[PDB]
Design an enzyme around this catalytic site. Structure first.
Site, PDB file in Angstrom:
ATOM      1  N   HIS A  71      11.538  -9.951   0.536  1.00 46.02           N
ATOM      2  CA  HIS A  71      11.306  -8.503   0.438  1.00 46.02           C
ATOM      3  C   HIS A  71      12.566  -7.649   0.672  1.00 46.02           C
ATOM      4  O   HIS A  71      13.277  -7.854   1.636  1.00 46.02           O
ATOM      5  CB  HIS A  71      10.195  -8.079   1.413  1.00 46.02           C
ATOM      6  N   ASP A  85       0.850  -1.206   0.000  1.00 44.00           N
ATOM      7  CA  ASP A  85       0.000   0.000   0.000  1.00 44.00           C
ATOM      8  C   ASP A  85       0.877   1.244   0.000  1.00 44.00           C
ATOM      9  O   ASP A  85       2.028   1.188   0.415  1.00 44.00           O
ATOM     10  CB  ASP A  85      -0.977   0.007   1.185  1.00 44.00           C
TER      11      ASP A  85
END
Lengths: 70, 221, 220, 70
Positions: free
Chosen positions: B182, B59
């Site tokens: 990540h 997001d």
């Protein structure tokens, strides 16, 4: 003050793999970077809308982690 | 061509509602992030047919003046975020053409066919992953399917168990699907920084004869 | 229609390059097989909406005058290849209605909704599996998918671990998917000849009221 | 001479299941049939573009196999 620059959502397994302990739900890695000491300050909290603190992990220039359970 | 995965999705209730619930929050008093003018930048800077590489992000940035519609990318003066800073470490190491920019504006990659998609398109100032129940995912899920349906040979750079896997079941032999941890500092080391996603992602393009991507940022006006 | 997304695929660079790369090779000096005029015969003889059964094959016959676009099927005078010959034995035994023709021309099956699809559509004379890096698989993959998407109740006759399995993950609920060893002589005996694919395929087709298939060849 | 009529691609397991030995990659079954003696001459080679010979299998009228490693 401590400016959090990003907040990444992770899963119990991804965090267990690093922390050595397994969070009981999604974790939010809140990161604040320090230009100078070249340190990454990370606040691991539960997912929205609680943001209940889980752990605190300090990492240096060459990736050593100083973990602490909250 | 975005007048595909948009023409009817954009009329469907689920996405119709996600928009207004965001709109109300805005006028209702809460400052929601990617200014409604920037919300759709990803699809602007890169068209369906140009999508050469696809990077998935979560997001938007929830602090002031950071996010502008592209995943990971910040505006021309904001501090380079931990993960973008790391993506840079990998780059200045993997691609010997390089050196690092001086900012986190990645629109250059954007107009070179690199689709920087967030799975959830808006966020409340200060509240991370707050808008994660409106319907941005079901829309964003549509988008990926369409890329997987109407396109061939796209590289899906999937980072983190959330983006890779979970929200990414693409046709493994219709599209290239590279996976890795990540870039986040609580993860980049002990297991990510060794991958060669950027070089590999260019390696398979020349292979198809396609013009490769220039991962060296820049800074327009 | 086949003007069902084949319209999009056919513009995709990958399916544009697989064409020209094959074209150049042709005029560049090399005799590639299924003359362009024949390359797409499988879609011609049987339409999308008519596809009652689907038989998967590998690449075309790389010898002169054998192939003409349909998998397994040879032209009106060529020697019946070992695998087709075996397919005949199974048939000669399983279906008490027929005998055996004296050729390998199978267009009859084609116009009866039997789709004889090769996963790779072209080959270089004498060089087996030589064109298996152009992009015929990915096109052919799209094709099976579409049959699995827009169609219902199709029998997929999959032979050989390569065709069955490998290149064949069809919704085994909406479609009938029979598996078995490849009819090749280095395999037909070792566990294939016992299956009843041709009879079963008609058994199904019939159970849905659909008109069955006549597996007895014939000439145009 | 020896006219190969067809060339079928097989996988290590399919071949091992027949040959008793497992091929380290894809195999190409090159078959040449014999109208008369009613024999199927098979040349198993590696996949394109090497076609490196692997095994030679002779099979008679009632399926017996005369294998020989190349």
């Amino acid at each position: 003050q401590l400016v959090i620059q990003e907040s990444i959502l992770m899963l119990p397994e991804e965090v267990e793999e690093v922390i050595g302990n397994k969070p009981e739900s999604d974790i939010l890695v809140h990161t604040a970077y320090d230009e100078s000491t070249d340190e990454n300050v990370m606040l691991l909290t539960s997912d929205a809308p609680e943001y209940k603190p889980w752990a605190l992990v300090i990492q240096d220039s060459n990736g050593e982690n100083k973990i602490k359970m909250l | 061509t975005w007048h595909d995965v948009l023409a009817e999705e954009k009329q469907q209730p689920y996405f119709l509602n996600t928009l207004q619930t965001v709109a109300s929050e805005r006028q209702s008093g809460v400052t929601i992030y990617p200014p409604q003018k920037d919300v759709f930048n990803a699809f602007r800077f890169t068209e369906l047919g140009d999508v050469k590489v696809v990077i998935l992000g979560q997001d938007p940035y929830h602090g002031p003046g950071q996010a502008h519609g592209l995943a990971f990318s910040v505006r021309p003066g904001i501090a380079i975020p931990p993960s973008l800073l790391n993506m840079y470490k990998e780059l200045e190491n993997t691609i010997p053409g390089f050196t690092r920019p001086n900012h986190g504006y990645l629109e250059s990659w954007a107009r070179q066919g690199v689709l920087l998609l967030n799975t959830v398109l808006t966020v409340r100032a200060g509240q991370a992953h707050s808008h994660a129940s409106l319907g941005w995912e079901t829309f964003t899920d549509k988008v990926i399917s369409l890329i997987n349906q109407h396109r061939e040979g796209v590289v899906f750079l999937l980072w983190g168990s959330h983006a890779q896997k979970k929200g990414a079941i693409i046709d493994k032999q219709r599209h290239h699907v590279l996976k890795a941890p990540h870039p986040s500092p609580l993860s980049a080391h002990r297991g990510f920084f060794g991958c060669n996603h950027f070089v590999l992602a260019n390696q398979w393009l020349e292979q198809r004869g396609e013009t490769p991507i220039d991962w060296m940022p820049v800074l327009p006006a």
